[PDB]
Amino acid sequence: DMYIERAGDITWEKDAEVTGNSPRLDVALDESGDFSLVE
Amino acid sequence: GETTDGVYRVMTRRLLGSTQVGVGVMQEGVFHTMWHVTKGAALRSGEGRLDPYWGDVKQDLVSYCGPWKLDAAWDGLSEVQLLAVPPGERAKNIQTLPGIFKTKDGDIGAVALDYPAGTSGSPILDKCGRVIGLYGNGVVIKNGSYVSAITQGKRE
Numbered sequence: 001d002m003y004i005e006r007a008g009d010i011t012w013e014k015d016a017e018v019t020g021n022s023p024r025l026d027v028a029l030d031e032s033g034d035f036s037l038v039e
Numbered sequence: 040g041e042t043t044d045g046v047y048r049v050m051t052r053r054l055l056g057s058t059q060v061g062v063g064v065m066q067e068g069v070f071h072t073m074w075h076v077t078k079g080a081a082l083r084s085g086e087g088r089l090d091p092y093w094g095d096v097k098q099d100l101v102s103y104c105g106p107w108k109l110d111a112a113w114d115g116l117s118e119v120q121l122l123a124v125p126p127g128e129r130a131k132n133i134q135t136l137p138g139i140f141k142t143k144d145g146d147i148g149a150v151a152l153d154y155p156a157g158t159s160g161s162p163i164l165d166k167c168g169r170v171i172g173l174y175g176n177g178v179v180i181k182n183g184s185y186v187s188a189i190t191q192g193k194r195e
């Protein structure tokens with residue numbers, strides 16, 4: 001049995017840790033909702 | 040039980056101890072999460088019960104108590120915030136510039152941040168704080184890291 005517990009408000013925070021890159025990926029989405037790479 | 044707007048952890052006591060399997064958004068009395076988190080099962084909120092209302096395996100989304108309410112979209116230009124809620128850890132905003140998933144049916148925004156599978160369902164926000172999608176469904180790149188789509192439902 002699953003249950004939910006509150007974790008916080010949904011707000012944009014100024015001066016948050018800025019990280020992560022922006023890759024352009026060729027992908028395919030199957031009927032089971034799974035993404036895969038196309039190369 | 041608790042129906043206040045906000046971000047919530049999805050827990051289970053079926054495995055060892057209490058394990059976090061995902062995350063979700065409460066907005067306008069509707070709980071929104073990814074399909075793979077609950078597999079469409081009922082949820083508990085204190086003494087109250089949340090029943091599935093809409094869901095789709097291919098979109099990997101599910102709504103509880105009512106129809107999908109989130110309809111903000113990534114503008115294709117600006118940085119966004121992943122409001123990451125990792126297992127056993129505090130909610131934390133991470134700002135990033137999204138990449139692109141190119142598909143045969145159009146392009147989708149993608150966030151390149153690596154978090155545990157139990158973080159699935161964490162909302163991605165725009166500068167106004169509106170939920171533009173959920174984090175948790177994507178691909179494992181050549182490195183081994185995860186790159187998630189910005190998955191958004193449709194507001195009927």
Ligand SMILES: O=C(Nc1ccc2c(c1)CNC2)c1cc(Cl)ccc1-n1ccnc1
Pocket residue numbers: 032033034075099154155156157158159174175176177179185
């Ligand atoms: O497993 C994940 N996501 C997932 C799982 C099951 C299904 C789907 C997506 C969609 N169709 C069913 C996952 C999520 C995150 Cl946030 C980080 C890594 C992840 N990961 C994928 C492989 N190994 C780990």
